[PDB]
Design a protein around this ligand. Structure first.
Ligand SMILES: Nc1ncnc2c1ncn2[C@@H]1O[C@H](COP(=O)(O)OP(=O)(O)OP(=O)(O)O)[C@@H](O)[C@H]1O
Ligand SMILES: Nc1ncnc2c1ncn2[C@@H]1O[C@H](COP(=O)(O)OP(=O)(O)OP(=O)(O)O)[C@@H](O)[C@H]1O
Ligand SMILES: Nc1ncnc2c1ncn2[C@@H]1O[C@H](COP(=O)(O)OP(=O)(O)OP(=O)(O)O)[C@@H](O)[C@H]1O
Ligand SMILES: Nc1ncnc2c1ncn2[C@@H]1O[C@H](COP(=O)(O)OP(=O)(O)OP(=O)(O)O)[C@@H](O)[C@H]1O
Ligand SMILES: Nc1ncnc2c1ncn2[C@@H]1O[C@H](COP(=O)(O)OP(=O)(O)OP(=O)(O)O)[C@@H](O)[C@H]1O
Ligand SMILES: [Mg+2]
Ligand SMILES: [Mg+2]
Ligand SMILES: [Mg+2]
Ligand SMILES: [Mg+2]
Lengths: 12, 305, 308, 310, 312, 311, 304
């Protein structure tokens, strides 16, 4: 199987 | 999973069970197509779009091909799910109600299977209508700010997937966030206006058909004192007028004793004209003139009305 | 999972086993609505929104259907978390609690199914009441900068779920910044009220309601304590009362006596009145959590868009 | 995880590994009589932490114990020292959480660690939470360059810190900052004690010097009254820096840059007994300047004299 | 990660890999007599690193070793050279950190980098940390429009630089930083730096010893008066004098005609050109052709700043 | 990232997959005596990168090679040509940087690019880095509306440029090009030794430009170079070449070659290859394009290089 | 692959035999003189393709031949028409590149197509090569929520720019082009939309099979639609054909003899007032403001 995580990036 | 007309059977042995459970879960109160005030043009294009091929299927052979896609844009509260539910009632087509929470897809490469299986299942039941509410979600830019490397695949599968007939309806509150390849692919982009001073009289005189009105017949004056109400709020005005008929006799003090026939003395009471004056000083429109003009400018720069 | 009324049972099979634990974690008769003073309009809509459709349910039909939403708005110290607990005490309805923190998950596509499960259980149990706290988060217009993708689909699942059946739910919310709300969300909230700071007459009833139970002198002139506050937040009145009541310990020098000859000295102190010296010393020490411009901006906003 | 009083145990089954580890990571014998002055905050700590262990039948109804207190003042006056002193003198469990233990690259941890922190602080004991430099943690909500994933933390503090009439377990929230006017208008209401801390005046620095110099041999040339009269506007940290630089100036009277190794370890024993004369202070008084001129002190004084709860 | 003295180890499990790599990537034959001038900074480094290494029993109690120093000067003088000199002439491990080590794309990775750096420098040795160009990290804290991540870095420096609440565990750390603009540091970071020192542009005798230092190995004539060369360069920095020396060393090559000689007769004349000495005319021609990186306003502002708020 | 000399390879395990593409996207012939005038830049480049190639045994110790140079002056005066010439004349690798490549979306995704570029330039052969238009990259540090994404590039340049100095792997030479040299830092200009200002105009060199550009096989009677060189007043080094292109198009535009298709095409084309140019279309070109150059920029640059220029 | 001029053939046997089968399908009798405007682009195509290949030393050095051109304008101008016109006018192997010849199933075969194309372009003839919709394949290069595969295809495209052979491109949104592309694009000339004459032919051809009244005049219709692109005349005739239905009353009446009125509607014919009502309501797909941003771009960065 394969799962998915989530990220959080910031930008200007 | 049931069969269809003429006893055909879909050979859905090629997918997992929760996917077909999800897409069957996205599949009666008979409302009326004349139960909506205003907007004759969209009723015309729906009449040409789904009803007329049923009656006369020989006219739509060559250059008179019926339309295949459509989008309504306008402010919130003009009734964009109302036309959808009305045409879901008064038709023989099998309706559908897809959403963005209907495409959750905790695994990877499973929303794609859901959209492809949805569109292949839609070509099984022959007259079909697909209703995608609030296409702003899944309808951002393909190089926008917040995106993974997976939702772009959903948008591309949707663009190639749209090519046995179906017809897709959709709506938004914010039209300018839409794409370009998604915008050009939708054949008919229609602005929805707020109700004018003539439609409001029909709307408030039509909604008030159960309660006894006596002499508040200044419907021209009641449509003239409300300048810019947003359609879904005048029904709240009539509802607040009924509750203002209730609030006049102090019933917060009574606790159980004789509180059943006290309502019977108020279940026969009629809506007088004093209720509207206290009803106009307690309701303001939900918006300012900001989103309406922006939707008007977007429908003037791209709308094929 | 418990059973609802009439012995039915829910089929929660498509949902994962930690979502159900979360919503089960989201879920008596202590106080009453006569405790909270002032605020006549929200008391009226609460009386004609949950109490009265339990007595005569054959009257609220058709055009007279009961309300479906409300949102409080006002300064951050006037009391709008208290009324939610009060209506949690004085009803027979399954009261939920959901804040903005038990909706997030580090997997893709769990933050929209929690809301669906929440509304489905709120339909399934009873004529229930959900109370969404601090709705300014999960709010805001969707054409903002720096808006992440799941935080759009939460607002989408809310906006599709809050409409469209004689099973009643009455969603209510509270915020301090109502102008930073989404436009297509504050139409669904059928009643938007304003909550003012208390005037010169409610403050006396607050002072009298607070000082009950503690033995006081009969010479405390309440009218001067009423007319001298003049801009207090409504929650600062209770703090003024607590400072004036605990000030009697700062009168007797209890900094040196420890352990011995002290545990009886406090018993000598435990029946001492709270005289006017404590109030005159307490007014020089406590100032409001001020900046009355926020009250003025929320007043102008709810006087240009509010449905009283 | 540890156990608690009465041998119970928490059940952290709904949380992952690194969350309970990161809250596990935030969990001598000095007394409170080393602090110079500051009677009011000592009074509030006395009637808020010390007294509810001895006589608990008193603090019952309207006399419920406090729940929060913010110290505010110019930098370098003794804020973290009171916190460490109360940690070493009480019997409570002590949490020192600061604004770096609340962030992670995943989504949904910035709001969960706060909830697990408060639930463990309620589960263990009559505990004390000490958030240091909350001005970074709580800013204004409706502001310009605010990222979205900090509003969750602000709302989490704003809900959690006021939650029936049961559950007679106590949690005291202490916080320090030096820019208090950037706190949000709804989080300043939760902190019901907003004391201001002043710079030391001319009667306190004499006692501070007299506390700091005990333990090292000195002469009786020193006039502490003149030393208090010239050291005006200093911090506490500058006074300690002065009292240290005097002794290191006594090292500089013996030029040891030339010698290297040869009887050098036996050289300093002639220096390890030397006295600290008045010339040392007469050099260190012009060796050291104050840290910052008065512009933050006047802003904090004009702030706490209008919105401050002493 | 390598082990330390006494065979111990660090259990770096709670951080990800690339943070450990990005701090691990930030880790002889010089002398401390190669620094012309700067007596007091040599005094502080003498009495804060080299003396506790020999006699640690003297430095305890009120005579604790210092934990801070910031060098503020105009941008010409030697502020990097002194740090590399103390890095070579020690037995303690060195950590250089510039402003681009504390940077990542994700959210909340700068803080864990600073945390890991301080814990590693505490674990390995009585080490020394050199944060060069400090003004690009700590600005002010409430100015107009800084991002919501740099303020966390300032908070992390503030909460970590003082500490070690246990009165035991005297594992020494000494943080060193150089900048050009000291009137732009936050006050709560400024008092954490004791021993804030000013550094001047060099004097007459410093310039004389500089020209004496720079011209060794290369043969010069015996008609060179160093005194006029000192007295004419009124206003030169400590970095332009070496550039003047280099130009006076290459002017003897530009004096002959090698731009015209192309390929042929090039390798045959370069062997005898190395013995041609350096006369006064090369110094006069270089001195007419070299002007300082002037603008004496900045030296004035920095000296008035460190004369108002400075601690020597 | 292909390879380098002597068959080695790079190990870029520390960076992302989009950053290294932005630096890989930053990597015809020309003759040296094409560039006329400006003997000082030839002198500095000859004693900078030419002579250390054949003779590395002379340049050791105090005689270390230079590491910086700045060309100030008016726009369009031949800076890119000298860059290409010193690129192609030696066997050096040639990087080029503008302001439009040091820009990406995420915070801190620009500062890894500069360090990666300098690590590559030390990793490869002895190379030349041409950072053009640094008046936008390097402003002043203590400005008013200076972003918190602009100071860190300046700090990275200052820390990286002067790097721990004993017999390095290969020399690397950085150039510069700027139209406004008073708006530069006080800590960045010090890393730039050998600052030099170059002017635009000349009379005899403009004549030599015309003699090196006007390679028309016709026009044996258009020899009026004294008046053609007296009419180059205020014309920059690109202006005369654009004038020459204007004259060579007005050769076939002064004669009616418009709508000769079908009828009289090949004879009208082949009798035009020897067609005599005169001062007619040259006079058309003289009064067509006026120079858009102002003297204030030249005067202020000549004033700035007087005080702070190390020629 | 077939041969070229002077009897040679390409040997790409090191690469695959279906890549060459995927590019070989890219190499007519279009309107050579029948364009009644835009004589400047015909002049530059006559003097940059034919004349430096008839007299090869007339354009050299200072009279320089170009090497690239980025045509900007509407999606309704005849870029393909004049492109195939120069194809059938010159003696050049006219290649084509669409948005679909840059997709292949393997990895590493999405970059070799460009290389093999440039090799064939230099091998065959005095060629001229064209790439359509470069603003759709290549926008901004190095994004991160754009995955690295399109970044590498664009990198191999810029790596194969150094290809005699003349490269050519056409765009529709020109400020979306990258900064490194316009420095090689020596000219970006502004192309206005076609004329009164072009629409009437598609009007007369697109209305076959439909019963039309013989009172309609194509001149008055052809002169009042100034500003329309190619698909808008099809939209106009579609709205006319549906206005034919919209004249009657069919939503109100139902059931009783509806098919008689529908047979009368199928028997009915279009009026001139039908085209009037179709033209008085139908708007263009894009409003006349993207042309202003295009002219701002050609004024700012373009050579026009
Ligand atoms: N034109 C209308 N005539 C009668 N009632 C209306 C009309 N428009 C809105 N309403 C009332 O307002 C409600 C709003 O319905 P609906 O959701 O379709 O509006 P909407 O604009 O689609 O909302 P949104 O787009 O914000 O989701 C309806 O239930 C209906 O009772
Ligand atoms: N006017 C009031 N009437 C009754 N209780 C009050 C009043 N003002 C403050 N309180 C006290 O305030 C406490 C809770 O604060 P409150 O109810 O004001 O929440 P709130 O400040 O409205 O919430 P928020 O911070 O989100 O605005 C209760 O313990 C209650 O005793
Ligand atoms: N009033 C005081 N009594 C005793 N010691 C003091 C006093 N003021 C300062 N000090 C000494 O000064 C040093 C600095 O104190 P502390 O670390 O609390 O400063 P701070 O308040 O944390 O600074 P900031 O507010 O900038 O964080 C301490 O070591 C303390 O011993
Ligand atoms: N006091 C000194 N003794 C010996 N050499 C010096 C001295 N001051 C400067 N120099 C020489 O000047 C040159 C430049 O010094 P350095 O590179 O340290 O300046 P810097 O400190 O980096 O300036 P900044 O930090 O502002 O960039 C060095 O090569 C050094 O040899
Ligand atoms: N000395 C010269 N000899 C021959 N051609 C020259 C000379 N100077 C300028 N030119 C011509 O001028 C044109 C512009 O030169 P270059 O490309 O260096 O511009 P630039 O100086 O880089 O402009 P900017 O500095 O504003 O970027 C060159 O293409 C070249 O043809
Ligand atoms: Mg709707
Ligand atoms: Mg609250
Ligand atoms: Mg502190
Ligand atoms: Mg330096």
């Amino acid at each position: 199987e394969e799962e998915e995580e989530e990220e959080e990036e910031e930008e200007e | 999973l049931p069969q269809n007309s003429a006893g055909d059977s879909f050979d859905a042995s090629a997918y997992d069970a929760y996917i077909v459970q999800a897409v069957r879960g996205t599949m009666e109160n008979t409302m009326s197509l004349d139960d909506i005030i205003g907007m004759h043009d969209v009723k015309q294009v729906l009449h040409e779009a789904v009803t007329l091929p049923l009656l006369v299927p020989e006219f739509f052979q060559g250059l008179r091909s019926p339309w295949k896609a459509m989008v309504l844009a306008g402010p919130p509260g003009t009734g964009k799910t109302l036309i959808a539910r009305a045409i879901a009632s008064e038709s023989s087509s099998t309706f559908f109600t897809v959403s963005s929470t209907d495409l959750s897809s905790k695994w990877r490469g499973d929303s794609e299977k859901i959209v492809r299986l949805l569109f292949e299942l839609a070509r099984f039941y022959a007259p079909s209508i697909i209703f995608i509410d609030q296409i702003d979600t899944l309808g951002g830019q393909r190089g926008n700010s917040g995106e993974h490397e997976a939702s772009r695949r959903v948008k591309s599968e949707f663009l190639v997937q749209m090519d046995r007939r179906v017809f897709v309806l959709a709506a938004t509150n914010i039209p300018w966030e839409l794409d370009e390849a998604l915008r050009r692919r939708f054949e008919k982009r229609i602005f929805i206006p707020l109700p004018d001073i003539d439609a409001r009289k029909k709307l408030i005189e039509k909604s008030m058909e159960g309660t006894p009105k006596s002499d508040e017949i200044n419907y021209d004056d009641l449509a003239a004192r409300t300048e810019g109400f947003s359609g879904a709020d005048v029904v709240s005005l009539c509802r607040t007028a009924a509750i203002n008929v209730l609030r006049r006799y102090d019933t917060k003090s009574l606790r159980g004793g004789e509180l059943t026939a006290a309502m019977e003395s108020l279940k026969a009471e009629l809506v007088r004209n004093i209720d509207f004056e206290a009803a106009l000083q307690a309701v303001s429109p939900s918006a300012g003139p900001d989103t309406m003009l922006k939707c008007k400018e977007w429908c003037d720069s791209f709308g094929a009305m």
